[PDB]
Design an enzyme around this catalytic site. Structure first.
Site, mmCIF file in Angstrom:
data_model
loop_
_atom_site.group_PDB
_atom_site.id
_atom_site.type_symbol
_atom_site.label_atom_id
_atom_site.label_comp_id
_atom_site.label_asym_id
_atom_site.label_seq_id
_atom_site.Cartn_x
_atom_site.Cartn_y
_atom_site.Cartn_z
ATOM 1 N N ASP A 180 0.949 -1.072 0.172
ATOM 2 C CA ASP A 180 -0.103 -0.153 0.006
ATOM 3 C C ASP A 180 0.896 1.223 -0.097
ATOM 4 O O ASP A 180 0.438 1.982 -0.866
ATOM 5 C CB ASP A 180 -0.805 -0.041 1.269
ATOM 6 C CG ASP A 180 -2.254 -0.517 0.819
ATOM 7 O OD1 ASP A 180 -2.528 -1.147 -0.274
ATOM 8 O OD2 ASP A 180 -3.345 -0.516 1.729
ATOM 9 N N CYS A 214 -2.017 0.622 -13.205
ATOM 10 C CA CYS A 214 -2.151 0.440 -12.002
ATOM 11 C C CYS A 214 -3.193 1.736 -11.758
ATOM 12 O O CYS A 214 -4.169 1.702 -12.536
ATOM 13 C CB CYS A 214 -0.970 0.831 -11.370
ATOM 14 S SG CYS A 214 0.034 2.493 -12.235
ATOM 15 N N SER A 215 -3.440 2.220 -10.624
ATOM 16 C CA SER A 215 -4.390 3.263 -10.601
ATOM 17 C C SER A 215 -4.205 4.411 -11.656
ATOM 18 O O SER A 215 -5.021 4.583 -12.392
ATOM 19 C CB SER A 215 -4.659 3.977 -9.315
ATOM 20 O OG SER A 215 -5.826 4.738 -9.065
ATOM 21 N N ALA A 216 -3.225 5.127 -11.675
ATOM 22 C CA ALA A 216 -2.983 6.383 -12.438
ATOM 23 C C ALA A 216 -2.125 5.969 -14.022
ATOM 24 O O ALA A 216 -2.411 6.871 -15.017
ATOM 25 C CB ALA A 216 -2.127 7.514 -11.952
ATOM 26 N N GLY A 217 -1.675 4.723 -13.804
ATOM 27 C CA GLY A 217 -0.761 4.167 -15.246
ATOM 28 C C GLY A 217 0.463 4.974 -15.325
ATOM 29 O O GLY A 217 0.716 5.041 -16.716
ATOM 30 N N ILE A 218 1.210 5.245 -14.521
ATOM 31 C CA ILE A 218 2.600 6.013 -14.448
ATOM 32 C C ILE A 218 3.465 5.402 -13.698
ATOM 33 O O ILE A 218 4.652 5.327 -14.266
ATOM 34 C CB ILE A 218 2.377 7.486 -14.663
ATOM 35 C CG1 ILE A 218 2.046 7.973 -13.324
ATOM 36 C CG2 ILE A 218 1.616 8.191 -15.847
ATOM 37 C CD1 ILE A 218 2.093 9.538 -13.076
ATOM 38 N N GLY A 219 3.278 5.062 -12.277
ATOM 39 C CA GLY A 219 4.140 4.724 -11.404
ATOM 40 C C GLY A 219 4.659 3.413 -11.416
ATOM 41 O O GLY A 219 5.659 3.146 -12.138
ATOM 42 N N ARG A 220 3.760 2.408 -10.927
ATOM 43 C CA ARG A 220 4.391 1.051 -11.014
ATOM 44 C C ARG A 220 4.344 0.551 -12.562
ATOM 45 O O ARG A 220 5.201 -0.204 -12.908
ATOM 46 C CB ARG A 220 3.060 -0.098 -10.527
ATOM 47 C CG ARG A 220 3.045 0.216 -8.678
ATOM 48 C CD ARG A 220 1.855 -0.296 -8.248
ATOM 49 N NE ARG A 220 1.424 0.479 -6.906
ATOM 50 C CZ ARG A 220 0.502 0.181 -6.108
ATOM 51 N NH1 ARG A 220 -0.394 -0.839 -6.508
ATOM 52 N NH2 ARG A 220 0.339 0.729 -4.837
ATOM 53 N N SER A 221 3.322 1.035 -13.121
ATOM 54 C CA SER A 221 3.265 0.765 -14.965
ATOM 55 C C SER A 221 4.490 1.127 -15.726
ATOM 56 O O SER A 221 5.114 0.225 -16.272
ATOM 57 C CB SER A 221 1.965 1.597 -15.307
ATOM 58 O OG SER A 221 0.846 1.109 -14.987
ATOM 59 N N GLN A 261 6.967 7.708 -10.197
ATOM 60 C CA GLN A 261 6.449 8.820 -9.696
ATOM 61 C C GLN A 261 7.294 9.432 -8.272
ATOM 62 O O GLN A 261 6.925 10.255 -7.685
ATOM 63 C CB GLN A 261 4.816 8.322 -8.927
ATOM 64 C CG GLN A 261 3.983 8.324 -10.320
ATOM 65 C CD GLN A 261 2.480 8.046 -9.527
ATOM 66 O OE1 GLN A 261 2.370 6.648 -9.416
ATOM 67 N NE2 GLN A 261 1.519 8.678 -9.225
#
Ligand SMILES: [Mg+2]
Length: 281
Positions: A180, A214-221, A261
């Site tokens: 999280d 992912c949620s925003a599609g930039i960090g984990r993605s 991010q």
């Protein structure tokens, strides 16, 4: 070598400085379509928008807008679609994009609920006998099979275009253990996950681009595509030590804003590529 640079930044405590330098050099391109009033409810986050030049266009007669970008890596010969987690009103758009772009795989790097909030709509069926119809885009989606492992779940889905009655098998790769807060302690299970996606054929040139969110599609993605591309280049080049993760990330940032991010996500990316390269030997 990349490993020597890693230990240097670690010893000097300069991850934040290196990351701010990437933020400062990152491309800036217009997102005029994402910002049209008619599209406000197709965007999860005001500060994460696709560039006009690289956005994915929906085909169906209507509004062609979805929050999704084509990342086209020329030297690595890999393409990725990065998108936000679907919203309650964009699940039909999401599956329309998968159909029209001829994707074989969807990679999901978040849980539907994290930190006690909804990060994405429940956009796939949870029971074989309870299929989903998307009436706005005329698509039917059925759960065919589900294999739950300790760090990830793979699902086989059947996507049917109700207009033409054509069906395709889609593979859903769900990484279920990203914490999280922060990044994983070890990259070992994230790398195992990446190699499972590769082994499926989902990333191969005979298919359309893999859809990653992912949620925003930039960090984990971002971490997923950056790690995949760097490891491919290290296999392809005569001099694997020439692969510069910061150069590759700036290239990817020409196609979608904000990839990676946090400084911790940058550090984790270095860690995954360094460990991943030892496994490919
Ligand atoms: Mg059952």
């Amino acid at each position: 070598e990349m490993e020597k640079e890693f230990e240097q930044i670690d010893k000097s405590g300069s991850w934040a400085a290196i990351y701010q330098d990437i933020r400062h050099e990152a491309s800036d391109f217009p997102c005029r379509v994402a910002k049209l009033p008619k599209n406000k409810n197709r965007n999860r986050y005001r500060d994460v928008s696709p560039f006009d030049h690289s956005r994915i266009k929906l085909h169906q007669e209507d509004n062609d807008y979805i929050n999704a970008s084509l990342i086209k890596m020329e030297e690595a010969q890999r393409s990725y679609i990065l998108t936000q987690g679907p919203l309650p009103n964009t699940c039909g758009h999401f599956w329309e994009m998968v159909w029209e772009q001829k994707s074989r795989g969807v990679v999901m790097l978040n849980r539907v609920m994290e930190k006690g909030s909804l990060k994405c709509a429940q956009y796939w069926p949870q029971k074989e006998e309870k299929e989903m119809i998307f009436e706005d885009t005329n698509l039917k989606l059925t759960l065919i099979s589900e294999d739950i492992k300790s760090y990830y779940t793979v699902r086989q889905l059947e996507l049917e275009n109700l207009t033409t009655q054509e069906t395709r098998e889609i593979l859903h790769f769900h990484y279920t253990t990203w914490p999280d807060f922060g990044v994983p302690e070890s990259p070992a299970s994230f790398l195992n996950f990446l190699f499972k996606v590769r082994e499926s054929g989902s990333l191969s040139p005979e298919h359309g681009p893999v859809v990653v969110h992912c949620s925003a599609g930039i960090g984990r993605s971002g971490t997923f595509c950056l790690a995949d591309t760097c490891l491919l280049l290290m296999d392809k080049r005569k001099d694997p030590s020439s692969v510069d993760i910061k150069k590759v990330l700036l290239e990817m940032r020409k196609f979608r804003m904000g990839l990676i991010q946090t400084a911790d996500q940058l550090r984790f990316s270095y860690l995954a590529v360094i460990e991943g390269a030892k496994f490919i030997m």
